[PDB]
Structure formats: structure tokens, C-alpha cells
Design a protein around this motif. Structure first.
Motif, mmCIF file in Angstrom:
data_model
loop_
_atom_site.group_PDB
_atom_site.id
_atom_site.type_symbol
_atom_site.label_atom_id
_atom_site.label_comp_id
_atom_site.label_asym_id
_atom_site.label_seq_id
_atom_site.Cartn_x
_atom_site.Cartn_y
_atom_site.Cartn_z
ATOM 1 N N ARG A 46 6.103 0.514 -31.097
ATOM 2 C CA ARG A 46 6.087 0.928 -31.973
ATOM 3 C C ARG A 46 6.956 0.731 -32.944
ATOM 4 N NH1 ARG A 46 7.063 5.646 -29.273
ATOM 5 N NH2 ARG A 46 5.736 7.346 -30.352
ATOM 6 N N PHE A 47 6.376 1.504 -34.063
ATOM 7 C CA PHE A 47 7.951 0.376 -35.462
ATOM 8 C C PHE A 47 7.864 1.630 -36.636
ATOM 9 C CE2 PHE A 47 6.015 -3.569 -34.881
ATOM 10 C CZ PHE A 47 7.527 -4.115 -33.587
ATOM 11 N N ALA A 48 7.662 2.667 -36.570
ATOM 12 C CA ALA A 48 7.036 3.945 -37.655
ATOM 13 C C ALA A 48 6.112 4.785 -37.237
ATOM 14 C CB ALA A 48 6.269 3.032 -38.667
ATOM 15 N N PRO A 49 6.235 6.220 -38.043
ATOM 16 C CA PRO A 49 5.907 7.117 -37.499
ATOM 17 C C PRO A 49 3.714 7.229 -37.985
ATOM 18 C CG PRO A 49 7.375 7.820 -39.134
ATOM 19 C CD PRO A 49 7.094 6.201 -39.200
ATOM 20 N N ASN A 50 4.222 5.849 -39.330
ATOM 21 C CA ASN A 50 2.264 5.157 -39.687
ATOM 22 C C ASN A 50 2.494 3.897 -39.331
ATOM 23 O OD1 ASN A 50 1.041 8.291 -39.960
ATOM 24 N ND2 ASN A 50 3.265 8.000 -41.179
ATOM 25 N N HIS A 51 1.308 3.278 -38.288
ATOM 26 C CA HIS A 51 1.266 1.152 -38.632
ATOM 27 C C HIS A 51 -0.078 1.254 -39.546
ATOM 28 C CE1 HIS A 51 3.825 1.458 -35.036
ATOM 29 N NE2 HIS A 51 3.271 2.622 -35.175
ATOM 30 N N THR A 52 1.463 -0.062 -40.756
ATOM 31 C CA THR A 52 -0.582 -0.359 -41.435
ATOM 32 C C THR A 52 -0.226 -1.900 -40.442
ATOM 33 O OG1 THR A 52 1.572 -0.769 -42.989
ATOM 34 C CG2 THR A 52 0.607 1.445 -42.734
ATOM 35 N N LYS A 53 -1.658 -2.178 -40.907
ATOM 36 C CA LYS A 53 -1.736 -3.866 -40.875
ATOM 37 C C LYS A 53 -0.479 -4.441 -42.139
ATOM 38 C CE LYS A 53 -2.544 -7.861 -39.581
ATOM 39 N NZ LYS A 53 -2.977 -9.195 -40.684
ATOM 40 N N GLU A 54 0.009 -4.071 -42.633
ATOM 41 C CA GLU A 54 0.868 -4.623 -43.915
ATOM 42 C C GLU A 54 2.320 -4.432 -43.377
ATOM 43 O OE1 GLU A 54 2.693 -4.680 -48.220
ATOM 44 O OE2 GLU A 54 2.827 -2.157 -46.971
ATOM 45 N N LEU A 55 2.637 -3.835 -42.355
ATOM 46 C CA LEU A 55 3.585 -3.531 -41.594
ATOM 47 C C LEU A 55 4.092 -4.132 -40.742
ATOM 48 C CD1 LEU A 55 6.485 -2.030 -41.654
ATOM 49 C CD2 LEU A 55 5.612 0.139 -40.011
ATOM 50 N N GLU A 56 2.512 -4.227 -39.928
ATOM 51 C CA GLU A 56 2.788 -5.547 -38.623
ATOM 52 C C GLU A 56 2.768 -6.738 -39.805
ATOM 53 O OE1 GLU A 56 0.045 -2.855 -35.881
ATOM 54 O OE2 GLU A 56 -0.958 -4.816 -36.558
ATOM 55 N N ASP A 57 2.614 -7.241 -40.229
ATOM 56 C CA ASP A 57 2.456 -8.549 -41.069
ATOM 57 C C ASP A 57 4.044 -9.397 -41.247
ATOM 58 O OD1 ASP A 57 -0.535 -9.739 -40.639
ATOM 59 O OD2 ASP A 57 -0.418 -8.697 -42.982
ATOM 60 N N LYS A 58 5.035 -7.747 -41.683
ATOM 61 C CA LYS A 58 6.266 -7.965 -42.361
ATOM 62 C C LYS A 58 6.753 -8.115 -41.055
ATOM 63 C CE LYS A 58 9.335 -8.045 -46.117
ATOM 64 N NZ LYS A 58 8.509 -9.082 -47.178
ATOM 65 N N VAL A 59 7.138 -7.652 -40.210
ATOM 66 C CA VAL A 59 7.904 -7.297 -38.788
ATOM 67 C C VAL A 59 7.584 -9.190 -38.084
ATOM 68 C CG1 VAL A 59 7.796 -7.200 -36.309
ATOM 69 C CG2 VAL A 59 7.612 -5.587 -38.447
ATOM 70 N N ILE A 60 6.347 -9.305 -38.405
ATOM 71 C CA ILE A 60 5.967 -10.945 -38.132
ATOM 72 C C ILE A 60 6.510 -11.704 -39.135
ATOM 73 C CG2 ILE A 60 4.281 -12.786 -37.383
ATOM 74 C CD1 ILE A 60 2.716 -10.179 -36.741
ATOM 75 N N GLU A 61 6.701 -11.454 -40.011
ATOM 76 C CA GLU A 61 7.548 -12.985 -41.086
ATOM 77 C C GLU A 61 8.691 -12.259 -40.615
ATOM 78 O OE1 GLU A 61 8.269 -12.151 -45.195
ATOM 79 O OE2 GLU A 61 6.724 -12.834 -45.658
ATOM 80 N N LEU A 62 9.744 -11.137 -40.655
ATOM 81 C CA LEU A 62 10.988 -11.451 -40.240
ATOM 82 C C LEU A 62 11.552 -12.026 -39.051
ATOM 83 C CD1 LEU A 62 11.509 -7.799 -42.482
ATOM 84 C CD2 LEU A 62 12.303 -9.955 -42.830
ATOM 85 N N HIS A 63 10.486 -11.940 -37.981
ATOM 86 C CA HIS A 63 10.915 -12.262 -36.793
ATOM 87 C C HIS A 63 11.158 -14.078 -36.803
ATOM 88 C CE1 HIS A 63 9.320 -12.573 -31.973
ATOM 89 N NE2 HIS A 63 10.588 -12.531 -32.767
ATOM 90 N N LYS A 64 10.374 -14.343 -37.765
ATOM 91 C CA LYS A 64 10.131 -15.634 -37.506
ATOM 92 C C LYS A 64 11.333 -15.986 -37.672
ATOM 93 C CE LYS A 64 4.972 -16.707 -39.021
ATOM 94 N NZ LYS A 64 4.485 -16.762 -40.272
ATOM 95 N N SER A 65 11.989 -15.224 -38.946
ATOM 96 C CA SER A 65 12.964 -15.566 -39.495
ATOM 97 C C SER A 65 14.892 -15.865 -38.754
ATOM 98 C CB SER A 65 13.395 -15.264 -40.815
ATOM 99 O OG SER A 65 13.993 -13.504 -41.000
ATOM 100 N N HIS A 66 14.100 -15.090 -37.662
ATOM 101 C CA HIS A 66 15.024 -14.615 -36.572
ATOM 102 C C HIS A 66 15.374 -15.390 -35.596
ATOM 103 C CE1 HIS A 66 15.794 -11.047 -38.552
ATOM 104 N NE2 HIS A 66 14.777 -10.470 -37.632
ATOM 105 N N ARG A 67 15.084 -16.725 -35.622
ATOM 106 C CA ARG A 67 15.025 -17.776 -34.831
ATOM 107 C C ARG A 67 16.471 -18.331 -33.865
ATOM 108 N NH1 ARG A 67 11.449 -20.905 -32.158
ATOM 109 N NH2 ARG A 67 9.889 -20.005 -33.605
ATOM 110 N N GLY A 68 16.616 -18.266 -32.689
ATOM 111 C CA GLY A 68 18.011 -18.595 -32.130
ATOM 112 C C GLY A 68 19.420 -17.498 -31.592
ATOM 113 N N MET A 69 18.396 -16.087 -32.542
ATOM 114 C CA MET A 69 19.067 -15.083 -32.244
ATOM 115 C C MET A 69 19.218 -14.215 -30.705
ATOM 116 S SD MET A 69 18.692 -11.411 -34.844
ATOM 117 C CE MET A 69 19.284 -12.865 -36.170
#
Ligand SMILES: COc1ccc2[nH]cc(CN(C)C)c2c1
Length: 284
Positions: free
Chosen positions: A148-171
Motif C-alpha cells: 500500500r503506497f497511497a490513500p488511492n492506488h492507480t495503475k499509473e502509480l503502480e507502473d511508476k513504482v515499478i519503473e523507479l524500482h528497476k533504477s535501484h538495482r544493487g541498493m
């Protein structure tokens, strides 16, 4: 020796149960909870309970539990009381972890408003800490269905979490939780305890209690701030709350600013949290 069962909602949503002697001070229960959590940097945290009006109150560790919960159930939550302005200066990773868990609930609950992008950033750091490196094999599926990331989830929000998650490799987890906190600490409502009130003219305002002082929200235009060092005395009388301000340079007299609270309990509660903030952030 007669003991009362205590139930404590932890920041992960799970329930800690223990027994304390019925005449116990709050510190006794707090110490048991902090030991359970392996938490050594205890000064930032506290227990809350609900009063007969269902309002959140801090359990005063220096006062008998029975004299605070009174006729209610011995049911509490474990919470951050003083939000550190610079979480990087905390000595332990596990302290920062509990602070992240609290902020995650502040965000989902809507107490901590947050832009789309910062919701996605914060979520991406949590996912990186708890699951580790993005699995490129999942590619387009939902391994984050439980977060749970926000008071209201959207598909767009889920997509953006995944895009940024990809950028944190090795963290690593402490690294990801530190980045979470470096973003969250900058949010305009970070660590602000908000109280409905009226000014001396009866205009609806909110009073925010935080590290940086007492904030006044009159609406979206014209805010005000009383930095704690300027505040010499905090007081309450019936439904009224007052701050006495240091005389300005070359001014003959101090100033007293008065506010109307929803009732007497609300004025006393605001007074107590202000005095506690004033002390904590004077010493920190
Ligand atoms: C920012 O928090 C506070 C609150 C009350 C204070 N009284 C004196 C100080 C001194 N501080 C600026 C080191 C203070 C700070």
C-alpha cells in the motif's frame, strides 16, 4: 500481584500482548514494547491510546496507565512521537526502519499529503528494501500487490513504482530506507501533528505541531510559524490555548496569542504536545 493485559498495535499492523501490574507507569509498558521491537533509540517514539471521546492521546510514561486510559480498554498503538528533522543522524538502521513504517501509514492514511512522483519514489524504495533487486522476469506482472503506497492506488502509480524500482538495482535495505527518509523529510507536512482550532476572531484554522515550531494554516494563502525558541510559555484555560512570545528586539512587552479549541480536552492535549515538542527539540 494483579496484572492487566495490554494490547499494542505495532507499525507493521501486528498485535503485541503483555501483562503489566495494574498500578504501572506508562514507561513499564513502553520498555516491554521497545524490547520486543529491538529498539534502542526510544526517545523518538511513544504509545497512543483513545480517550472516551475516541481522540488519540500520548500515554505519558511518567504517569500511571490506569489514570490515563481510565474507563477504556488497555489498548494502545506504537507510534513515532518526535519526527527527526534529519533521519540520517539516527545511530541505528532499525530506528530508521520504524520511522519508515510510521511514514508509510502517515502516507496511506492521508495525514502526509504527497505528489504522485514522491508517492512512486517512496514506494520504489520500500519495494527495493523489502524485495531487493527488481526481477526483470516478472516484466509487467504485480509482485507488489500487497504494498500500500497511497490513500488511492492507480495503475499509473503502480507502473511508476515499478519503473523507479528497476533504477535501484544493487541498493541494500538500510540504503533504500535512508533514501525513503531523505525524500519524506522534505514533505511540507512531514512530522506535523494537526489540530482544528479558531483564531481570536473565530476564523477556522489548523495548528501544526512539529520540530520547527507551531504552524498556523489559515487556508492555502497566509500561513504563520512560531519557532519554539520564541515561545516562552504555553497555557490553556477552558477551551482556549495561548502562547506567550518573547518581546521582539526594542519592544517593551511580550505578546500572548490565543486560540479556541473544539473543547477543554482538545486545548489540554494541544498544550501537552506543544510543551513536549518544545522540550524535545530544545535538547536534540
Ligand atoms: C527548535 O527547537 C528548539 C525549541 C526550543 C528552544 N529553546 C532554546 C533553543 C535553543 N536551540 C536553538 C539550540 C530551542 C530549540
Amino acid at each position: 500481584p494483579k496484572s492487566m493485559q495490554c494490547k499494542v498495535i505495532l507499525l507493521d499492523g501486528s498485535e503485541y500482548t503483555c501483562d503489566v501490574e495494574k498500578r504501572s507507569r506508562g514507561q513499564v509498558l513502553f520498555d516491554k514494547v521497545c524490547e520486543h521491537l529491538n529498539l534502542l533509540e526510544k526517545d523518538y517514539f511513544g504509545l497512543t491510546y483513545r480517550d472516551a471521546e475516541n481522540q488519540k492521546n500520548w500515554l505519558d510514561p511518567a504517569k500511571e496507565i490506569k489514570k490515563q486510559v481510565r474507563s477504556g480498554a488497555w489498548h494502545f498503538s506504537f507510534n513515532v512521537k518526535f519526527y527527526p528533522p534529519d533521519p540520517a543522524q539516527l545511530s541505528e538502521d532499525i530506528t530508521r526502519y520504524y520511522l519508515c513504517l510510521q511514514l508509510r501509514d502517515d502516507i496511506v492514511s492521508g495525514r502526509l499529503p504527497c505528489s504522485f512522483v514522491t508517492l512512486a519514489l517512496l514506494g520504489s524504495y520500500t519495494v527495493q528494501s523489502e524485495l531487493g533487486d527488481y526481477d526483470p522476469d516478472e516484466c509487467g506482472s504485480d509482485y507488489i500487490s500487497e504494498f500500500r503506497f497511497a490513500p488511492n492506488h492507480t495503475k499509473e502509480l503502480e507502473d511508476k513504482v515499478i519503473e523507479l524500482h528497476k533504477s535501484h538495482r544493487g541498493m541494500t535495505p538500510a540504503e533504500a530506507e535512508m533514501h525513503f527518509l531523505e525524500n519524506a523529510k522534505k514533505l511540507s507536512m512531514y512530522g506535523v501533528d494537526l489540530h482544528h482550532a479558531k483564531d481570536s476572531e473565530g476564523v477556522e484554522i489548523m495548528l501544526g505541531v512539529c520540530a520547527s515550531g507551531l504552524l498556523i494554516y489559515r487556508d492555502r494563502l497566509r500561513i504563520n510559524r512560531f519557532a519554539w525558541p520564541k515561545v516562552l510559555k504555553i497555557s490553556y484555560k477552558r477551551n482556549n490555548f495561548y502562547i506567550k512570545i518573547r518581546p521582539g528586539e526594542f519592544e517593551q512587552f511580550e505578546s500572548t496569542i490565543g486560540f479556541k479549541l473544539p473543547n477543554h480536552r482538545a486545548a489540554k492535549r494541544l498544550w501537552k504536545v506543544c510543551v513536549e515538542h518544545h522540550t524535545f527539540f530544545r535538547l536534540l
